[PDB]
Design an enzyme around this catalytic site. Structure first.
Site, PDB file in Angstrom:
ATOM      1  N   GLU B  13       0.799  -1.237   0.000  1.00 37.01           N
ATOM      2  CA  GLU B  13       0.000   0.000   0.000  1.00 37.01           C
ATOM      3  C   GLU B  13       0.835   1.293   0.000  1.00 37.01           C
ATOM      4  OE1 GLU B  13      -2.095  -1.399   3.484  1.00 37.01           O
ATOM      5  OE2 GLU B  13      -3.850  -2.011   2.346  1.00 37.01           O
ATOM      6  N   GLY B  79     -12.325  -4.819   1.715  1.00 32.46           N
ATOM      7  CA  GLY B  79     -13.317  -5.796   1.272  1.00 32.46           C
ATOM      8  C   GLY B  79     -14.645  -5.103   1.027  1.00 32.46           C
ATOM      9  N   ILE B 153     -12.357 -10.765   6.720  1.00 29.89           N
ATOM     10  CA  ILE B 153     -13.746 -11.216   6.531  1.00 29.89           C
ATOM     11  C   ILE B 153     -13.850 -11.960   5.213  1.00 29.89           C
ATOM     12  CG2 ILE B 153     -16.189 -10.511   6.286  1.00 29.89           C
ATOM     13  CD1 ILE B 153     -15.013  -9.990   9.087  1.00 29.89           C
ATOM     14  N   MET B 173      -9.250  -3.334   8.391  1.00 34.04           N
ATOM     15  CA  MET B 173      -8.689  -3.651   9.711  1.00 34.04           C
ATOM     16  C   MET B 173      -7.927  -2.496  10.372  1.00 34.04           C
ATOM     17  SD  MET B 173      -7.487  -7.590   8.674  1.00 34.04           S
ATOM     18  CE  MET B 173      -7.095  -8.193  10.324  1.00 34.04           C
ATOM     19  N   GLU B 174      -7.949  -1.303   9.764  1.00 35.82           N
ATOM     20  CA  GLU B 174      -7.199  -0.143  10.291  1.00 35.82           C
ATOM     21  C   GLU B 174      -7.910   1.228  10.312  1.00 35.82           C
ATOM     22  OE1 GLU B 174      -6.151  -2.067   7.560  1.00 35.82           O
ATOM     23  OE2 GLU B 174      -4.853  -3.422   8.656  1.00 35.82           O
ATOM     24  N   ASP B 197     -11.286  -7.255  -2.944  1.00 37.54           N
ATOM     25  CA  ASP B 197     -12.114  -8.459  -2.867  1.00 37.54           C
ATOM     26  C   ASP B 197     -13.537  -8.080  -2.431  1.00 37.54           C
ATOM     27  OD1 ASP B 197     -12.373  -8.913   0.234  1.00 37.54           O
ATOM     28  OD2 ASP B 197     -10.226  -8.558  -0.100  1.00 37.54           O
TER      29      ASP B 197
HETATM   30  C1  LIG Z   1      -1.179 -12.516   4.804  1.00 41.35           C
HETATM   31  C2  LIG Z   1      -2.104 -11.504   4.166  1.00 41.35           C
HETATM   32  C3  LIG Z   1      -2.996 -10.874   5.231  1.00 41.35           C
HETATM   33  C4  LIG Z   1      -3.909  -9.838   4.599  1.00 41.35           C
HETATM   34  S1  LIG Z   1      -5.136  -9.287   5.746  1.00 41.35           S
HETATM   35  C5  LIG Z   1      -5.964  -8.039   4.826  1.00 41.35           C
HETATM   36  C6  LIG Z   1      -5.193  -6.725   4.864  1.00 41.35           C
HETATM   37  C7  LIG Z   1      -5.744  -5.746   3.828  1.00 41.35           C
HETATM   38  N1  LIG Z   1      -6.550  -4.767   4.585  1.00 41.35           N
HETATM   39  C8  LIG Z   1      -7.841  -4.408   4.005  1.00 41.35           C
HETATM   40  C9  LIG Z   1      -8.796  -5.514   3.610  1.00 41.35           C
HETATM   41  C10 LIG Z   1      -9.073  -5.883   2.289  1.00 41.35           C
HETATM   42  N2  LIG Z   1     -10.001  -6.874   2.208  1.00 41.35           N
HETATM   43  C11 LIG Z   1     -10.398  -7.239   3.440  1.00 41.35           C
HETATM   44  C12 LIG Z   1     -11.356  -8.217   4.029  1.00 41.35           C
HETATM   45  N3  LIG Z   1     -12.096  -9.051   3.269  1.00 41.35           N
HETATM   46  N4  LIG Z   1     -11.456  -8.258   5.373  1.00 41.35           N
HETATM   47  C13 LIG Z   1     -10.731  -7.449   6.187  1.00 41.35           C
HETATM   48  N5  LIG Z   1      -9.860  -6.523   5.737  1.00 41.35           N
HETATM   49  C14 LIG Z   1      -9.684  -6.390   4.397  1.00 41.35           C
HETATM   50  C15 LIG Z   1      -6.642  -5.224   6.003  1.00 41.35           C
HETATM   51  C16 LIG Z   1      -5.322  -5.927   6.137  1.00 41.35           C
HETATM   52  O1  LIG Z   1      -4.315  -4.914   6.130  1.00 41.35           O
END
Ligand SMILES: CCCCSC[C@H]1CN(Cc2c[nH]c3c(N)ncnc23)C[C@@H]1O
Ligand SMILES: CCCCSC[C@H]1CN(Cc2c[nH]c3c(N)ncnc23)C[C@@H]1O
Lengths: 229, 229
Positions: B13, B79, B153, B173-174, B197
């Site tokens: 990001e 998301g 999620i 998440m932030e 997503d």
């Molecule tokens: C090992 C990879 C871990 C990735 S965890 C997801 C990242 C991207 N950020 C935003 C994010 C996009 N889609 C989401 C979803 N479906 N649920 C919750 N957060 C999001 C939150 C966090 O910084």
């Protein structure tokens, strides 16, 4: 002496210290009140953060970065998981985890995000100081693992699950977050909790009944550590 | 000019901005790296916090209190909950809540703790500036509510539930944590997310496929706001 931060989550966890200190000044910062008092050669900064991980993270950061705290002692109450813990018993955290930080969909363990550990540790020297203060004043003190998250736990299934996954002796909503901030900013951290409930059915009722008294037990203890610091 | 903080959660990001800026200095602080670059008449401080509420809370606080940021722009991915949002679409938050801050056992609403509001607001002037930049460069930009919590999620039931309770257009998440810090410290905040997503079944797979590209869309946009600031 030195600058010491003393932090709880709720007014009940910090008010007993303000009453003991009598004389202090108050400053509005970060949508909260920070309290300043002298005590035995030390300069104290105290606050209650308001409940949870974000609020506690901000208070820890403000107390260290803006107000120059060199040591942080956390005092409050907790929900007991270990069956040998009774209401009112003191537990200090050797290490802590966030049970609700969850990217397990990517195959990582619960509590883990990249760049960080699952468990954050407290300062070993402060923990040994706590043990001497406990021996000196004939107070019973237990070492253990605390699981932190942003839910009030009052359910046997959830209690069992968190205990199983992290080998946790108690749960609460501010510990791991405060410990992380202090470790990141290179400040010795100590987390002390007195049990207010057992985190199962009707834990909310036990919490309301025992919070005031259990908070005083923890509060008294961290001030006794300030004497020896 | 002025001091501007630009914050993401992940390296994906923020890396596109570091590549665009070319010349910058680094400082190791708070178990992370903070990056410093000049841009037009402005002084920029950039970082990725690492994932989640505690990490993002600490980065926001450090950037304002230690590094003197007067404005904070958050850039990253999210998301999608609103069915009109497709992958890659831009959404800025008008207001945000923590869906996983839960003391509902005491009869309060989900997301509420005493001393605080359920929803935290972003700065109206920065939001209007975003609308002009969107019109000027023929980019589609949507206003909405973001629900923040410490879980990835990827479940249709949970998606539906969080959307129903908070009228949320996306999850992440932030956001709410960063917005809270900025409001408490009296700094104008702007939260921008590009969809990676749709937060249902196999959201983890869509995330891995689209994160890099969606992050660039958001990244580019916040730098265009810096031109007009
Ligand atoms: C090992 C990879 C871990 C990735 S965890 C997801 C990242 C991207 N950020 C935003 C994010 C996009 N889609 C989401 C979803 N479906 N649920 C919750 N957060 C999001 C939150 C966090 O910084
Ligand atoms: C309107 C009143 C709301 C009170 S929410 C509970 C308080 C007390 N703190 C510690 C705490 C003791 N027992 C617990 C349990 N069973 N679950 C989770 N946290 C705890 C966390 C938070 O600061």
């Amino acid at each position: 002496g030195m600058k010491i931060a003393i932090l709880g989550a709720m007014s009940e966890e910090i008010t007993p210290l303000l009453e003991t200190l009598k004389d202090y000044t108050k400053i509005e910062h970060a949508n909260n009140t920070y309290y300043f008092a002298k005590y035995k050669d030390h300069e104290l900064v105290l606050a209650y953060s308001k409940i949870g991980k974000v609020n506690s993270t901000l208070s820890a950061s403000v107390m260290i970065e803006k107000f120059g705290a060199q040591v942080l002692l956390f005092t409050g109450v907790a929900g007991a998981f270990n069956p040998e813990l009774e209401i009112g018993d003191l537990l200090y955290a050797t290490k802590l985890a966030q049970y609700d930080l969850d990217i397990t969909a990517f195959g990582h363990p619960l509590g883990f995000v990249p760049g960080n550990e699952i468990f954050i540790k407290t300062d070993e020297k402060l923990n040994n100081l706590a043990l001497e203060v406990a021996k000196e004043l004939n107070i019973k003190l237990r070492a253990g693992i605390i699981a932190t998250g942003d839910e009030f736990i009052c359910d046997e299934a959830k209690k069992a699950k968190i205990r199983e996954i992290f080998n946790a002796d108690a749960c609460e909503m501010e510990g791991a977050s405060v410990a992380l901030v202090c470790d990141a900013l290179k400040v010795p951290c100590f987390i002390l909790r007195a049990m207010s409930d057992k985190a199962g059915e009707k834990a909310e009722f036990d919490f309301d009944e025992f919070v005031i008294n259990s908070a005083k037990i923890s509060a008294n203890f961290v001030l006794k550590m300030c004497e020896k610091l």
